[PDB]
Design a protein around this ligand. Structure first.
Ligand SMILES: C[S@@+](CC[C@H](N)C(=O)[O-])C[C@H]1O[C@@H](n2cnc3c(N)ncnc32)[C@H](O)[C@@H]1O
Ligand SMILES: [Zn+2]
Ligand SMILES: [Zn+2]
Ligand SMILES: [Zn+2]
Lengths: 15, 248
């Protein structure tokens, strides 16, 4: 039950 | 706030003394290229520049290089040899940046000179994990009560983890109005992630990317970017599963 954590996802800047 | 230059991390004992005094970030294993946790680790068509063209300031393998247009770096066998300006990752042709302590995000990266738009900052290096490795680290980092997360999706189930081993790219914070972006480049048939400026970043400005964070944790981290369009949290409104965040 991780209270914190995640994965950064690569993407090109568009807006 | 304290600041340190990239060359301060090349001295383990000075760095460890600075880190006891809060003058540098906590120690991490400094690496120059990705290391694969388990053993699982093309000429362009540019006409060679003459010696006189090089003296005139002409660029070798510039905007019209077929390798550069496909986000592929040239090798030592490039028709432009030593002149090749398309080997930034291999040659470590980093932007001039400093590691700075921010008010509430931990350490961060700042421009030490004005950085033009589309400038290579640094490669996001780390330990490349498979999904089994990613899950074992998810459990450990949750067990240790780590604040900072350093997992970057690379391809399919593969993740670059800069928690224990990496370089100064692991200091780049998130912004909802970013001035950097990731780009996936191929070097020797291997995929690598680098940070590139998205605009003219004036000297002294913090460098940040839009993490587009896939949060698996129960509690969302508040975002302190301060932008007008701030999403409020790293990871937005919805929580994703450990399997989905990990690229499956
Ligand atoms: C890849 S690390 C960046 C370097 C980190 N600040 C450090 O001190 O090592 C990402 C972590 O920095 C913090 N962080 C980055 N950007 C943030 C932001 N806009 N608001 C709040 N925390 C942020 C969070 O703890 C996040 O998990
Ligand atoms: Zn070329
Ligand atoms: Zn080249
Ligand atoms: Zn924000």
């Amino acid at each position: 039950a991780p209270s914190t954590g995640g994965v950064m996802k690569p993407h090109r800047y568009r807006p | 706030g304290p600041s340190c230059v990239m060359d301060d991390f090349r001295d383990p004992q000075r760095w460890k003394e600075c880190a006891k005094q809060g003058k540098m970030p906590c120690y991490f294993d400094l690496i120059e290229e990705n290391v694969y946790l388990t053993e699982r680790k093309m000429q362009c068509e540019c006409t060679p520049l003459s010696k006189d063209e090089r003296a005139q300031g002409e660029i070798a393998c510039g905007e019209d290089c077929l390798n550069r247009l496909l986000m592929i770096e040239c090798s030592s066998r490039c028709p432009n040899g030593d002149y090749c300006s398309n080997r930034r990752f291999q040659r470590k042709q980093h932007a001039d940046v400093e590691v700075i302590l921010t008010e509430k995000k931990g350490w961060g990266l700042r421009a030490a000179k004005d950085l033009p738009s589309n400038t290579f900052v640094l490669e996001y290096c780390g330990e490349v994990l498979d999904h089994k490795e990613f899950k074992a680290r998810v459990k450990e980092y949750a067990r240790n009560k780590n604040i900072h997360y350093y997992f970057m999706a690379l391809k399919n189930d593969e993740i670059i983890d800069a928690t224990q081993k990496g370089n100064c790219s692991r200091f780049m914070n998130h912004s909802c109005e970013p001035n950097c972006e990731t780009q996936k480049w191929t070097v020797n048939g291997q995929l690598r992630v680098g940070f590139f400026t998205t605009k003219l970043v004036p000297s002294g400005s913090e460098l940040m990317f839009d993490y587009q964070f896939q949060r698996y944790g129960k509690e969302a981290q508040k975002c302190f970017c301060g932008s007008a369009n701030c999403r409020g949290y790293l990871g937005g409104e919805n929580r994703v599963s450990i399997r989905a965040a990990g690229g499956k």
